[PDB]
Amino acid sequence: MKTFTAKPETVKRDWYVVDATGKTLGRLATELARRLRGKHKAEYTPHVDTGDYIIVLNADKVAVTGNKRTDKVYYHHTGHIGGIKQATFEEMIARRPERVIEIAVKGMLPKGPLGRAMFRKLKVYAGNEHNHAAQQPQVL
Amino acid sequence: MRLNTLSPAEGSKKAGKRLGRGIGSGLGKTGGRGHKGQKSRSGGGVRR
Amino acid sequence: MYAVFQSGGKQHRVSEGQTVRLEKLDIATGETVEFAEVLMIANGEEVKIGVPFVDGGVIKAEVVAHGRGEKVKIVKFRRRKHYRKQQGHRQWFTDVKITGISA
Amino acid sequence: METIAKHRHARSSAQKVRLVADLIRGKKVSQALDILTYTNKKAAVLVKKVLESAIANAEHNDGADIDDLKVTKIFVDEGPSMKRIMPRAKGRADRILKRTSHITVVVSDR
Amino acid sequence: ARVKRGVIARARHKKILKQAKGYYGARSRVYRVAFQAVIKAGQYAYRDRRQRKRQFRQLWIARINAAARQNGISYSKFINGLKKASVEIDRKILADIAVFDKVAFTALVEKAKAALA
Amino acid sequence: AVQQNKPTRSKRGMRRSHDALTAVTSLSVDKTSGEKHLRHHITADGYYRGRKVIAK
RNA sequence: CCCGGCGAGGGGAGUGAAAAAGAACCUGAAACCGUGUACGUACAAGCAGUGGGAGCACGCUUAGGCGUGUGACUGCGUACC
RNA sequence: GUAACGGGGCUAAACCAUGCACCGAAGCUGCGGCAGCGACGCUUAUGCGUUGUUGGGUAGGGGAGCGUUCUGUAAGCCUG
Ligand SMILES: [Mg+2]
Ligand SMILES: [Mg+2]
Ligand SMILES: [Mg+2]
Ligand SMILES: [Mg+2]
Ligand SMILES: [Mg+2]
Ligand SMILES: [Mg+2]
Ligand SMILES: [Mg+2]
Ligand SMILES: [Mg+2]
Ligand SMILES: [Mg+2]
Ligand SMILES: [Mg+2]
């Protein structure tokens, strides 16, 4: 015979504390996404599990685009019709800034089971070095 | 004489060889390969 | 001393191991027989020494061996897409064993 | 074939009897007879009976006592049901299936 | 003069019920649905396998652009240098293999890396 | 009105997922051969605490 | 002979080359219905497979990422006439 | 029901111009195999060794074949 690619079950748990405590938004998302799938790939493969744990600090801070700070909605639509259809802008994101970024970093995933249970390897957090308990022990 | 393990011995008298051109054809009826039925989209023929 | 050798579509990861290939119709027999081989395979592994893709080694770069070099596999498959029907078929594939010595 | 007690037929379909035998299989036997005798529903037809046979056989032509026997396995297969016909409104007529099944129980345990 | 196609008949679809390769219910239980059980299977197959290259090249290519990024690189640059490089011809599929030996393959990057005459 | 296509077996069983069983094997006897339900003994030979009209 | 309602049906015993011939009785296929075991399966979406492929169970194959069963996750993908 | 970029997202991941690099098809090359047409060596009814070319296909035409029942070769051959 010949031979595969080796990505059995792997094991590269991590602690990468991607602060991104500043102006790094938008494009910044790609790295959190790519580093979730395994871009450098010490052995990985787009198909195996393991999001390679990451920790985005602050998050509650992003210059955003050039004006999508006051002008861009998200649009969710609940479910119970009554044509409610929820809409919220960004500057309107004061109750839970953590939500965003996590929202953005999503969709850029394989979409489905693998990429679904791969998102949690982010940890929201909106307030710099706080409750780092998510993995207080080891980091980078 | 040793039995079997010959391969054979000799062939029957009768052995009517290769004409085949003589015959062949025989013609397979239409009504075989998956989608047959063939003919026009009117099957013009039954009407003669 | 690890695989490098090419032919067919290049594929060498085995040292004292064996690897099937095309047919080597030029000559295969039972025992090996004058099997060419080259470091010139763009194989940058070799032994500790790097050995850039295709370094030197003109005349005697390395060699190999030869296993059974027979058998005719299976992967017949079938096929008459919606387009009415026709086809069916079945296809095998002849290969050659070959093991490999002195990388 | 330690005992093997089949009833065959019974006149009670299959799925009807199956439900009465399920939570009443392996081990027990002393319990089974209890389980069955207190579970109201005709399903218990010839089930309590076949066990009586499945235990009688294992008695008359075998060792075993009361402390033994566990009813190793049980199951019910569908059988030659009668096919009658019902009138129904209008000229219509519909076929009625009588339904039947073969009990069969084995207590090859000990 | 006689037919009673029966022993032949049963045999006939049995070949397809044999290759029923445990599908789902009627799919491997019937006869008529067993036939069409081949569209994505048998029908797609003869051609589906040869269509595979992408899945693996997209993989190796990935592995490569992945590793090579040790110095940052650019998958576009790598093969480029390694092309006008030495007699480098066989640089493919070795991707996942390169994963089995950075020390051995990180070196290949050096040769290619010398893009400038 | 009617089913538009045949319910699979994975469906009929998955529909019968409530076969239910009783026989809590609760207190049967307090003074007989193991008989009596969780309340009255063997009528005309049962009793709660003591022989009710008829016993053996 | 035995359980059973002097039932049904059945278990043994016997005849038989056979009862894997018991009278529904030669051979007994398929559809459909179970009992047992193995693997999978209760944050996962669509013609239900095919291509990659982890794990688990068997044989371990009596040495090698091997044959059978099953297939988490993944690229594709709207039956036939 | 976001819903007039596929999505995320982008102030350049948009637009103009230049350049190079890679990816990218069942296209092309490479390796083995098959069948029809011609070539060229062997070699002859010839079949072969290499070889240039061709092989999506409905209606429809042409050409090869597989299997069944029944008849002769069968009082043969296989068979408790
Ligand atoms: Mg997708
Ligand atoms: Mg038809
Ligand atoms: Mg017309
Ligand atoms: Mg028509
Ligand atoms: Mg290609
Ligand atoms: Mg019979
Ligand atoms: Mg689950
Ligand atoms: Mg496969
Ligand atoms: Mg054609
Ligand atoms: Mg045609």
UniProtKB/Swiss-Prot annotation, chain C:
It holds the Pfam family Ribosomal_L21p. One of its GO terms (molecular function) is structural constituent of ribosome. It comes from the Bacteria. GO terms for cellular component: cytoplasm; cytosol; cytosolic large ribosomal subunit. Keywords: Ribonucleoprotein, Ribosomal protein, RNA-binding, rRNA-binding. InterPro entries: bL21-like, bL21-like_sf, Ribosomal_bL21, Ribosomal_bL21_CS. PROSITE patterns: RIBOSOMAL_L21. The keyword rRNA-binding applies. One of its GO terms (biological process) is cytoplasmic translation. Belongs to the bacterial ribosomal protein bL21 family. Part of the 50S ribosomal subunit. Contacts protein L20. This protein binds to 23S rRNA in the presence of protein L20. This is Large ribosomal subunit protein bL21. It comes from Escherichia coli (strain K12).
Curated annotation (Swiss-Prot), chain D:
It holds the Pfam family Ribosomal_L22. CDD domains: Ribosomal_L22 (cd00336). One of its GO terms (molecular function) is structural constituent of ribosome. Keywords: Antibiotic resistance, Ribonucleoprotein, Ribosomal protein, RNA-binding, rRNA-binding. The keyword Lipid biosynthesis does not apply. The keyword rRNA-binding applies. This is Large ribosomal subunit protein uL22. It comes from Escherichia coli (strain K12). The lineage of its organism: Bacteria, Pseudomonadati, Pseudomonadota, Gammaproteobacteria, Enterobacterales.
Curated annotation (Swiss-Prot), chain E:
Keywords: Ribonucleoprotein, Ribosomal protein, RNA-binding, rRNA-binding. GO terms for biological process: cytoplasmic translation; ribosomal large subunit assembly. One of its GO terms (molecular function) is structural constituent of ribosome. It comes from the Bacteria. Gene3D superfamilies: 6.10.160.10, Ribosomal protein L20. Pfam families: Ribosomal_L20 (PF00453). PROSITE patterns: RIBOSOMAL_L20. GO terms for cellular component: cytoplasm; cytosol; cytosolic large ribosomal subunit. InterPro entries: Ribosomal_bL20, RIBOSOMAL_L20_CS, Ribosomal_protein_bL20_C. Belongs to the bacterial ribosomal protein bL20 family. PANTHER family: 39S RIBOSOMAL PROTEIN L20. Part of the 50S ribosomal subunit. Contacts L21. One of the primary rRNA binding proteins, it binds close to the 5'-end of the 23S rRNA. It is important during the early stages of 50S assembly. This is Large ribosomal subunit protein bL20. It comes from Escherichia coli (strain K12).
From Swiss-Prot, chain F:
GO terms for biological process: cytoplasmic translation; response to radiation; response to reactive oxygen species; ribosomal large subunit assembly. It holds the Pfam family Ribosomal_L32p. Keywords: Ribonucleoprotein, Ribosomal protein. GO terms for molecular function: structural constituent of ribosome. One of its GO terms (cellular component) is cytoplasm. Residues 1-37 are annotated as: Disordered. Belongs to the bacterial ribosomal protein bL32 family. This is Large ribosomal subunit protein bL32. It comes from Escherichia coli (strain K12).
